[PDB]
Symmetry: C4
Subunit: 431 residues, 4 copies
Amino acid sequence: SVGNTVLHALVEVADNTVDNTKFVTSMYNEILILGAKLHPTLKLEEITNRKGLTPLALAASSGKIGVLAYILQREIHEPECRHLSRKFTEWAYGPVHSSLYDLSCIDTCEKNSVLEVIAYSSSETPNRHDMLLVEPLNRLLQDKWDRFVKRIFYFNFFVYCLYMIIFTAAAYYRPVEGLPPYKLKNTVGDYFRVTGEILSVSGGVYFFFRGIQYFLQRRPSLKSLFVDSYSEILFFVQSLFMLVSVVLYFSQRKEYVASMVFSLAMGWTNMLYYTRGFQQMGIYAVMIEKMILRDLCRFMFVYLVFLFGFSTAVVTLIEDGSYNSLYSTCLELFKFTIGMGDLEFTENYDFKAVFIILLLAYVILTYILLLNMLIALMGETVNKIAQESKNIWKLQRAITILDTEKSFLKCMRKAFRSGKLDDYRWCFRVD
Amino acid sequence: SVGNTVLHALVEVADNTVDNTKFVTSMYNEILILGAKLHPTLKLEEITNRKGLTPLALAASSGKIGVLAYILQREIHEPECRHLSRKFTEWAYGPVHSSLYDLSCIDTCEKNSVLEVIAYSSSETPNRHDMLLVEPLNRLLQDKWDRFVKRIFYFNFFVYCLYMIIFTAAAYYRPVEGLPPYKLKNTVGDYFRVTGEILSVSGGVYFFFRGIQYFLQRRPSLKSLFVDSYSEILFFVQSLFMLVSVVLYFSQRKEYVASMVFSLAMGWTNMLYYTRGFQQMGIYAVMIEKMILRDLCRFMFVYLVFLFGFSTAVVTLIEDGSYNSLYSTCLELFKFTIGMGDLEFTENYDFKAVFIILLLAYVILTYILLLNMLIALMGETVNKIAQESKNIWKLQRAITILDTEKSFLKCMRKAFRSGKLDDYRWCFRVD
Amino acid sequence: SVGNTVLHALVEVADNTVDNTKFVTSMYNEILILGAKLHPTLKLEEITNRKGLTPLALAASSGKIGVLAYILQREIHEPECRHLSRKFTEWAYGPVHSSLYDLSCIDTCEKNSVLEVIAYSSSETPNRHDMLLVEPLNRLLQDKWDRFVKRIFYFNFFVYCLYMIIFTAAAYYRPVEGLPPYKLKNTVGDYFRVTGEILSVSGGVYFFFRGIQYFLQRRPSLKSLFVDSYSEILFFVQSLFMLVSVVLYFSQRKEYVASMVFSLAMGWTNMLYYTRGFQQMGIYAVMIEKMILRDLCRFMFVYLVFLFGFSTAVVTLIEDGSYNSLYSTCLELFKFTIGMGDLEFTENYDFKAVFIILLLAYVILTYILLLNMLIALMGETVNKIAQESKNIWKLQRAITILDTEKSFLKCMRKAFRSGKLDDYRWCFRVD
Amino acid sequence: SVGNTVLHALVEVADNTVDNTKFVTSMYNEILILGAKLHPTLKLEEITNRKGLTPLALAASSGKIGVLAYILQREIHEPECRHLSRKFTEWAYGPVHSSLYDLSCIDTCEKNSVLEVIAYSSSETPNRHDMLLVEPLNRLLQDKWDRFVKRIFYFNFFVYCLYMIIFTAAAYYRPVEGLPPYKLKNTVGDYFRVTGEILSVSGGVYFFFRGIQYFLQRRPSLKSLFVDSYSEILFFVQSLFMLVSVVLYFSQRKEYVASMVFSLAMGWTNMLYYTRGFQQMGIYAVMIEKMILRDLCRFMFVYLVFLFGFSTAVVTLIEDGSYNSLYSTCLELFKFTIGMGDLEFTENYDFKAVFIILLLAYVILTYILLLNMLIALMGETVNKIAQESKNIWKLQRAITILDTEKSFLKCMRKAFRSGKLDDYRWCFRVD
Ligand SMILES: C=C(C)[C@]12C[C@@H](C)[C@@]34O[C@](Cc5ccccc5)(O[C@@H]1[C@@H]3C=C(COC(=O)Cc1ccc(O)c(OC)c1)C[C@]1(O)C(=O)C(C)=C[C@@H]41)O2
Ligand SMILES: C=C(C)[C@]12C[C@@H](C)[C@@]34O[C@](Cc5ccccc5)(O[C@@H]1[C@@H]3C=C(COC(=O)Cc1ccc(O)c(OC)c1)C[C@]1(O)C(=O)C(C)=C[C@@H]41)O2
Ligand SMILES: C=C(C)[C@]12C[C@@H](C)[C@@]34O[C@](Cc5ccccc5)(O[C@@H]1[C@@H]3C=C(COC(=O)Cc1ccc(O)c(OC)c1)C[C@]1(O)C(=O)C(C)=C[C@@H]41)O2
Ligand SMILES: C=C(C)[C@]12C[C@@H](C)[C@@]34O[C@](Cc5ccccc5)(O[C@@H]1[C@@H]3C=C(COC(=O)Cc1ccc(O)c(OC)c1)C[C@]1(O)C(=O)C(C)=C[C@@H]41)O2
Ligand code: NA
Ligand code: NA
Ligand code: NA
């Protein structure tokens, strides 16, 4: 009905349990063998459904770990069936076994490769996180990293550091005259300043168009828009602030500074994107992302409810006879959170006992709030957050490898390890 | 002796263990079959005890989850006994099993339904918390939520937000002249102000009478008054502050403001009641409630003992030669807890070493106390607090559904799924 | 060699493991039966060693919980041996079994009873903590609590509250003239003041002599002096401060205030002693004690090493050209711990970069210290600290019951449950 | 190929698992027996590879705890093979077994002893950490500690305390005249000052040469430089600061103070080195070392990225119309971390909303950072950090014993327990 065959149904049946995995594996193997015996001329696994996914691509995209692990490491040691295998063993010693894997459909299917569907999954799949631990995929990604992607990624991080340093210098040394745009001066420092500004705007345009390219190629669902693509959204919003700053700058508004500094701040925090992909340092940025997306909404809602309620109570209580505004009272109550609450910031009230009782209740409740946030987050420290962060680190490495391979910047796409070692299957030697 | 029958004794025997659950289940099944064979004209499970509870209602109210799960999903596949079943399976596929459950006695018994006794239990029962996860009850509550209760609850939350915004505006813009009540002025701003005040008092009266209705219909035991009914108590106390404010306002006392701001503060914090029912955000309000009721007493007693002891020591030590009162010293020592302790807030003493030693001991002991509070709370985070909070979220969802169904605001009570599909058992189709 | 018999050796063999406990139980039963058959006229278990301990008292004092549990609940249902049993079951129903336990040697041996050795042991024994959960002992202690000790303990806590309130009032309203003792005034307030002072000194003398009595009766080893007897030490030191205050007061030194306030502070914190014995509120009172005795020494040593090192570095760096003392610099660096560190508290230096680097290093290191303290304490929260706190709560209840029974304040010692129900064995009915 | 024999390769087989440990045990026993039967005159285990390691030294250095445990406790009870054993039982009681272990190759091999290779390994080995718990090694190290090393270590700690007190006094009382060196005055205070300075520089020279000696003896790889030899690196850097201070002092620079205070601060914090060796107190210093080396880098990178980004945004936003420098803004934003952030530290801007939004975002993000650091560190508290800290404590105790034995300060190296009890195997009695 959906253009698929029995193998896609087999992929759908599996639920990453031992018995169902073995059942699906047995059916998959027997069906492949019988299909080869019935139709030796047909490629059984190359039929794509209406979504353009092969059974291997469907297993990769659907989060079916057992099926993917079986298929990628499938090996056959009987006549009339060796042509259906993907793994081939070259040497068999005690501790080490050297074997050739098939890179076909893993690096490219011309629509949807295995690494692409794994990396660019919706993140709502059951356990895609561990799919990169499968031997051929793990070693392929590590080889791609150590070969050429590592240097390219470090170069991109260095270039981003230069871009941010130039942006910081250009923004720091912005002229303080009124009503932009500003006329240049013959002093060399001003030529360096405008060169830095031009480079900053160029980088902003680059990130803007890269963000548009990402959103058009990925087409986020608008429900998982922030769950995935978080770093891309932050880079795009930083570029949006940069371009709004350019518009305000040429529109003769000093409010361009209001945009620019936000972009500047975002730009520096966007260096955490490059931190992700490091085994030790990337975990921290991953945890920041997950806390902001997942655990910050409820805390900020409850905290702002308490802050607004008690600030409205306090500002109602105080009357002039300084701080008479709701904003000032909100700031004074927020100061308690940062350990700078005066607790006698005004005397412009009647019923001092009421004012002090309100502030003490706010303090006690706010510390209860912070304590409950801590407790709620520490309830998830039993192997959950650590495993999730290591998994996201692996996924970021995979995504970086895929993006760098997509760019290649050399008009040359060849990045295979062993080559076509007839069975031209793009072998991959693993020792 | 208490008007009950053997089935209620069977309910009492069970203790939510596998062996006793199976034993009680076997006895219940055999008793029902034999009773139907002996008295085919009698409804065996409809006999109520002195408390008006059927054996199903007793199992639900008593926290006997195994017996409840057996009864609600009871199915019979033999002649002469099909009329004793509640579950009826109509289709049996691999992944799909479509069945009709019996809603009789779950939505209403005319005195005590299953959902009512589960939701309004004393909370001291063994395992009521997971009773809402039993398939017919979970599906029924989710159906009621998604059907009509979700919109009504969101509307009530929106109306409460409007009420609180109006109250905040009316209280913020209160006149600052002396000796209320204040004469209405012809300016439109004062017409809006008095309209907002009238609406605020109307909402206060509404919450006051709803609190009275809740306490009269529930009749809390005065020992679990705060363990359950916490949100209702907070709403009622907020309304009490509002009405005391009205009395003081018309009694020509400025002290009405002292009441009003507390109500205002409480009103905003009472928005957390609407937060409960959200799977992610409601856990925070649940944790706040549990910490205030359970853990705050211990910490507040120990902290106040240390604060009062050291403040009495300090105020005794200092002598005039500002802060000479016990209240001022208590505030100055409290300031250490919020990171604003001066540690040299006065020089009006002899024995500077004694004063500084007292303050340092207070600081060290207070941080020891806060550390031990953290430790004691973190000792309870091993899958306990999180599970309790998820359970309370489910219970609040059920309570919201029951209250909304009780109101109905349409002079129409019927909210059944499948209707009378002869055996008119108010079927509920689950797929 | 040590005056003991076979039963004491059997007690020593046990190590609170299932197999060794069963072995010791079998040997104890068989040797008791054989001894009764060989010497029917002798009481086998009444022989005491050189320490005055019976085998039951040795098992209780040595922390051999399995042997104690077997002996206290020993029951015999065969002829020629019933006289060797302690438990006597009178009724055996399904949910309830009504039995008589032997209180002989549990309430008194005239030297060392079971409850006395359990409560007043060094606390270094293996599992004295769970010995109070043994059915006869748990029910006996709960019965003693609910019968008469509960009211006496609450009365003592109330009297201590009155004593501390009187002390706080007398010390707060101390005269501010120089050179005590102070001549009285005919105003009634001064008569109340001197009456309060006399009552405060009387309470101090009472606690002084009670502390002496405790230390003479227990004779602490001076190595477990603080691990046990912590509350008694705090009460004794509070009384010592009171008596030193009396001496300084009559010695014409204002330094009596230096003593008095410490006593006052200690007195208020000593209310936590009465908090212990409550299942919930007592936990903090337990945990604080442990943190002071166990976890505070190492943290304070490391923290003071860092504080003193960086304070010496800073005070060396700064030079006059206010804070030039080591004490002032130590206070200014301590202020960082309480969130009140200025970070520019002086400009009296050369090399501002060095000063700021030192302060930033101190801040980062101190927050690492606090973080590592938290981490180390949280590493022991996996059922260890909480269980110890519950156990110490039970032990404090037992100690309170024993002390109250020792006092009795009625010239009447009998507090047995069932009496001499021939075999007059001071029965205790458990249902 | 590497100068080894079969025993070394067999030792390399083990991976500290039960099955491979048993396999290696059986093969090692059979190889030794057959070699003795084939070559009775040869010492089978004395053959060293190109690294100078015996199979025992290889098992110890390679972190093969099971093989080491078997070899060190090897015992033989058959003829023609007793000469191959190391453990010899002298008495066999029920709870006590008194046996003689062979100290040969444990105290010295003349190149690489067992204790030396265990203590001075790279720390990257699988399970060297628990090798010190092997009965002969644990008892030997405890015997060396209690015999003579405990007093020597406490003497060294006392001498270091005197050195640091003298250094603190000499640096505190440094003259405040310009342009060192300072001329000695005839007043006795300056004689004490110059004596203290000479002693401080002498201690610095001592630690400098001891650091060089250590680095020459170990030759760290420069990649594991800080993970092991952290304490020696800190002592060496303290001495480097001392000697740079000496050079600047005689170079007529006041900047010597800039060096001296660092060597003062480090010196006091280097007392934590002596804290290691206490069971309870040393864990804190171990945790500080691990926190600094492992976790501080990533947290400080992310924190400094946020601080620098928002400081650049804020300093760009503010314009003169005080704090106009990036350094001042960085300090003002750092103040939020220590609870002293003003949140209105300047008004020299336009767009107050932008400034306040930036500061609030920085505050919220920084507290998210601290919360995530806490969470990440608490995720590793499930028996991981505590066990590693206890292990490193045991390692430091062993290192202290080895260094003290290396010094001996008595021109006498003999420290064996039982001596040559014929078979002169340097027996060690364990009971
Ligand atoms: C798009 C979103 C969701 C976002 C954009 C801005 C407004 C952001 O605040 C938030 C909301 C916020 C505001 C204030 C405090 C905390 C969170 O979170 C990010 C967003 C969140 C941060 C903090 O997190 C990071 O950017 C670090 C980071 C971690 C992992 C990544 O993969 C990453 O990719 C670039 C970046 C930085 C800001 O962009 C920033 O510099 C300022 C001034 C505000 C931060 O909104
Ligand atoms: C009736 C009780 C028990 C209660 C009423 C008042 C006085 C309360 O303080 C307490 C005690 C207290 C006082 C100061 C600090 C902490 C706790 O807790 C609640 C009560 C507790 C809070 C904080 O908790 C909440 O109301 C949020 C909430 C969570 C879950 C809910 O189901 C809920 O239902 C409305 C509300 C808000 C206050 O009502 C408030 O706004 C002020 C000024 C004080 C709080 O007393
Ligand atoms: C005898 C000891 C060991 C002790 C006596 C004094 C000096 C003490 O500080 C300590 C050390 C100290 C000093 C400063 C901060 C923390 C700890 O701990 C107790 C001692 C510890 C405390 C804090 O702990 C408690 O007394 C609460 C408590 C808990 C459990 C109990 O069984 C108990 O019995 C009375 C008391 C209170 C003080 O006595 C006090 O009021 C002042 C001014 C200092 C405290 O020394
Ligand atoms: C060589 C390193 C790695 C080191 C040397 C200096 C600069 C150090 O800061 C660090 C980095 C640093 C800076 C500021 C805050 C935290 C960490 O960590 C240590 C180093 C770390 C510390 C804190 O840790 C300790 O020395 C305690 C300690 C624990 C365990 C040990 O075995 C130990 O051996 C001596 C010392 C103290 C300093 O030496 C010090 O006194 C000052 C002023 C800075 C600390 O650099
Ligand atoms: Na904290
Ligand atoms: Na924790
Ligand atoms: Na603070």
